[PDB]
Design a protein around this ligand. Structure first.
Ligand SMILES: Nc1ncnc2c1ncn2[C@@H]1O[C@H](COP(=O)(O)OP(=O)(O)O)[C@@H](O)[C@H]1O
Ligand SMILES: Nc1ncnc2c1ncn2[C@@H]1O[C@H](COP(=O)(O)OP(=O)(O)O)[C@@H](O)[C@H]1O
Ligand SMILES: [Zn+2]
Ligand SMILES: [Zn+2]
Lengths: 306, 309
């Protein structure tokens, strides 16, 4: 049995943060302990939203409860969007302390930054977070899933080509994480302008045998929320099964992603009218109805080894 | 697609309240919208626990958000443990308003107040809740799952036999709910002193004004341990199975109780293996093995047969 401590947002309706990460990990066999950093009615993609936030002190209280009961033994820690540097700093303390009892604990981090839609009632992420991610978070993270924009901020470098991306990924490796996956980029894929390009790199430490891969997925014509959280949660599961094969781990992860999105866009267009654009409420991920696809995804993409 | 609005507690670790109700409903195909009434590190069966509570105002804020976005359309509402009458009163307002847009909404309610451990009842909730459950909650509830102790408080009547239980269940039907399930009782089962007896009753008013009532009895072998979150798990699965078998309380209960059995057996086996020999399992070791019971919850092998009364 593998136990995951996931600390992310919670929404009453829809799927983002912990809502997008718990069901997938559960059906995949993981014991998930969920700390909801916030509780909103829905995500910020809607016109309205109401809810309450948890401060670093409250986060500490919860962790203390687990500690007092001697049940603070985890195999994985998983975090994502956060817009409070004080909260984020608290997370690092918790991870460090946990890695103390279990040097084998794996910390999966998705360093969210920018004007992204989230489930924490926020319209943006304060710039004062970059230095916390850069100097405290990344150094203790084992698997990180930044997008191109985030990868650039973390390394202070810009990416103009596939070769530069690989260089930035190497810079991230030296900062700490043995596995780095750039989930989406602006790089033009050789397959076509309609494909989204993702890059992956894993340092398997004994010299460092580095496995690098590239993946191209056809873009779906719509804006989704929570996809990044779903990605990170599934990558966690699949890397656990294929600890030394980033290629397979990413192929199953991205395949699932495809099935869920296809089912989601089909149902969204069916519920809205003819020629009517689906609304964010209609675009909520069809998580429950994708159970079989998440459990065992039919591979639909092939990762090319670089 | 059936959408459920579940308003119950949340624990970081373990399974109780919303943690025990969401996963089962999700694997069974239900779209679950969860409002966490509280967030604790774990349940109170542990020696320590820390967390925060939500007040009636915060509950209202959340509901308002759904309402402002016009996404307050539900098919089911599911509630359980509550320790604040103000919060409970707020729940009733929400249910009434929802039943306005959807006359077909089904409200499943587990009126938690206490249990009868050996012979004497003990209240977990302030006594000032009983009146609220009695006059405000039960009247708008469609399915209720009280234990013997709770059934007695709601009707002000004592249960000394199977016949008296059936009378109390009829009294509850008059108060509102067409479906009543007494999940556990002190009644001695004809099968043996080691079996737990549950009773079920579902009312159907025929077109001509006649009333057909299906009544059933169920006996389950006791597992030698104290579990937490089992009542929440029960109510969540009964919701799912009654949805599939709308007019057959017999089958709905057989599938529901069969799943309970599978989950508890797997849970006690793992607990004893983790404890050590001769060592009693701790509450932390007794947390329901929810995730590892996925298959059993999806399609339970029937292991109990309901007796029609
Ligand atoms: N419109 C889309 N079409 C196809 N895939 C998408 C789309 N949007 C997101 N994804 C998938 O979601 C993941 C991207 O998450 P995203 O919201 O873009 O995260 P990030 O902003 O962290 O790069 C990728 O694996 C990608 O394939
Ligand atoms: N020790 C046990 N042995 C067998 N079944 C149990 C045991 N404890 C709980 N259950 C199951 O859980 C449900 C009862 O929940 P329980 O803790 O007894 O709730 P309540 O006190 O509200 O009646 C029943 O369907 C019952 O079969
Ligand atoms: Zn992201
Ligand atoms: Zn109960």
């Amino acid at each position: 049995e593998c136990r995951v401590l996931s600390i992310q947002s919670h929404v009453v309706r829809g799927y983002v943060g912990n809502r997008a990460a718990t069901f997938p990990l559960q059906v995949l066999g993981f014991e998930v302990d969920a700390v909801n950093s916030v509780q909103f009615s829905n995500h910020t993609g809607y016109s309205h939203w109401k809810g309450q936030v948890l401060n670093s002190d409250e986060l500490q209280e919860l962790y203390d409860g687990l500690k007092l009961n001697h049940v603070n033994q985890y195999d994985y820690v998983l975090t994502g969007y956060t817009r409070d540097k004080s909260f984020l700093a608290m997370v690092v303390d918790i991870v460090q302390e946990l890695k103390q009892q279990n040097p084998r604990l794996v910390y999966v981090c998705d360093p969210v930054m920018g004007d992204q839609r989230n489930g924490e009632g926020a319209m943006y992420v304060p710039d004062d977070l970059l230095p916390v991610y850069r100097e405290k978070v990344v150094p203790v993270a084992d698997i990180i899933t930044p997008n191109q924009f985030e990868a650039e901020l973390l390394t202070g470098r810009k990416i103009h080509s596939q070769e530069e991306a690989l260089e930035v990924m190497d810079m991230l490796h030296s900062m700490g994480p043995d596995t780095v996956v750039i989930t989406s980029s602006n790089l033009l894929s050789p397959r076509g302008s309609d494909y989204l390009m993702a890059l992956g790199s894993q340092r398997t430490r004994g010299s460092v045998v580095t496995q690098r891969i590239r993946m191209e997925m056809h873009k779906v014509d719509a804006v989704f929320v929570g996809t990044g959280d779903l990605f990170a949660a599934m990558l966690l599961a699949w890397t656990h099964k294929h600890p030394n094969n980033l290629k397979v781990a990413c192929e199953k992860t991205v395949s699932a992603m495809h099935h869920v999105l296809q089912r989601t866009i089909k149902c969204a267009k069916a519920k809205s009218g003819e020629g009517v654009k689906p609304s964010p409420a209609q675009l909520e991920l069809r998580m429950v109805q994708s159970k079989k696809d998440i459990e065992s995804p039919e591979i639909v993409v092939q990762a090319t080894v670089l």
